[PDB]
């Protein structure tokens, strides 16, 4: 998981249907990638919360 402070949330409303939309942005620096010494390429995934469950991107 990425720290809460790194996340920048946006509380938006859609035109097609009157429902709560959420948009989150996270900055990734060169220093983060070049200092990462894992087996695979520096990857990221998105997890969203609802009253029924969760979904991965």
């Amino acid at each position: 998981w990425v720290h809460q402070n790194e996340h920048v949330s946006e509380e938006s409303l859609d035109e097609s249907s009157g429902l709560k939309v959420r948009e989150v942005f996270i900055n990734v620096t060169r220093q983060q990638v070049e200092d990462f010494h894992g087996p695979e390429d520096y990857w990221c995934q998105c997890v969203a919360w609802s009253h029924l469950g969760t979904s991965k991107s």
Partner: protein, 368 residues
């Protein structure tokens, strides 16, 4: 005579001394110090101060004590320090006489017999592993007892006296959970198997940071193909005269032991060998100058087994041939956890049912 050799990225370098003279490296760097020397894109130039200290260690292992040398300056021989930067190899070398030392790097011979040498103490844990760094000339002892789903720390001891008395110098907090007893220390860096993965993690003890993570292809992991006692000992690491080794098993070889040489810098497979011995049937294994030694032994839970405590199989990497042996192995206790060979002292660093012991070796000149 002092020389200078330069070659850009993916361009192989050539080193040759006149007559029968030997090459001797003094200073080596793989990266970028000057921008106008190499010719490439201007974006990579005038922006990076790239350095690689391990450059000297790599060149000394290949070019030194040899007449001619050819090293491909790429990811096959040199690990990438700064990504997205066109690198080069700067080497300063001198020509000196050909005469080289004996029995230092050299193989002491074929194993003739294993005898009991030292008994340090009786640890709180039944399983675990202990070893020393054979590259660095120090009396430092690295200790790591195995706790299922909880192993995440390595303990360092100043001397043999402190290890028995239980006086530790420092404890390292590892970035990942460790699987099985299979682990070693190679030139101030720790190599281990990460929990629920077929990956080897490199952790520099000096900087206390992870430097790399290598995937051992098709290797069975997490109690799939461990030793007789089990305990997630699916992947075992070994150190000998030839270098760093990985003892494991693949489903392609039908659970049989697969041995692969690993580069301690680039973290890549530099050769793969398939044996006839099943890993689960074996108790532990060790490498001595390119030769695998498979230990078959009895356990406390075994109801009078026809399997005596002896080394019954050997595999040579250079010859790619195997033989059935019968060397007597110490059986004082019944739960053999780990067996590691140290090329500096030519002894076995063993863990047998809570007990931490050292075994003396008898070598025969059977090599030719």
């Amino acid at each position: 005579v002092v020389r200078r050799e330069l070659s850009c990225e993916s361009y192989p370098i050539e080193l040759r001394c006149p007559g029968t003279d030997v090459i001797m490296i003094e200073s080596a760097n793989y990266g970028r110090t000057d921008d106008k020397i190499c010719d490439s894109d201007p974006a990579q130039m005038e922006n990076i101060r790239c350095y690689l200290p391990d450059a000297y260690k790599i060149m000394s292992q290949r070019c030194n004590n040899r007449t001619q040398c050819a090293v491909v300056a790429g990811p096959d021989v040199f690990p990438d320090p700064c990504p997205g930067t066109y690198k080069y190899l700067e080497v300063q070398y001198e020509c000196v006489p050909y005469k080289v030392e004996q029995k230092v790097f050299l193989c002491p011979g074929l194993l003739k017999g294993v005898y009991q040498s030292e008994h340090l103490f009786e640890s709180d844990h039944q399983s675990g592993a202990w070893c020393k760094d054979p590259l660095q000339a120090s009396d430092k002892i690295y200790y790591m007892p195995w706790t299922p789903y909880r192993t995440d720390t390595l303990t360092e001891y100043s001397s043999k006296d402190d290890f028995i008395a239980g006086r530790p110098t420092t404890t390292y907090k590892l970035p990942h959970r460790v699987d099985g007893t299979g682990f070693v220390v190679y030139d101030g860096a720790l190599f281990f198997n990460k929990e629920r993965t077929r990956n080897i993690v490199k952790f520099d003890l000096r900087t206390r940071i992870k430097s790399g993570e290598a995937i051992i292809a098709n290797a069975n992991y997490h109690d799939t193909s461990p030793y007789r006692w089990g305990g997630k000992s699916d992947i075992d690491l070994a150190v000998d005269e030839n270098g760093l080794w990985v003892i494991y098993a693949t489903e392609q070889n039908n659970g049989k032991i697969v041995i692969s040489q690993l580069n301690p810098y680039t973290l890549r497979i530099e050769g793969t060998w398939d044996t006839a011995y099943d890993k689960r049937s074996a108790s532990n294994a060790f490498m001595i100058c390119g030769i695998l030694y498979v230990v078959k032994s009895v356990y406390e839970d075994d109801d009078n087994e026809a399997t005596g405590n002896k080394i019954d199989y050997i595999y040579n990497t250079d010859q790619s041939k195997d033989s059935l042996v019968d060397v007597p192995f110490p059986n004082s206790y019944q739960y053999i956890a780990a067996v590691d060979y140290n090329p500096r002292d030519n002894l076995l660093y063993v863990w047998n049912n809570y007990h931490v012991v050292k075994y003396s070796l008898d070598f025969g000149p059977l090599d030719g």
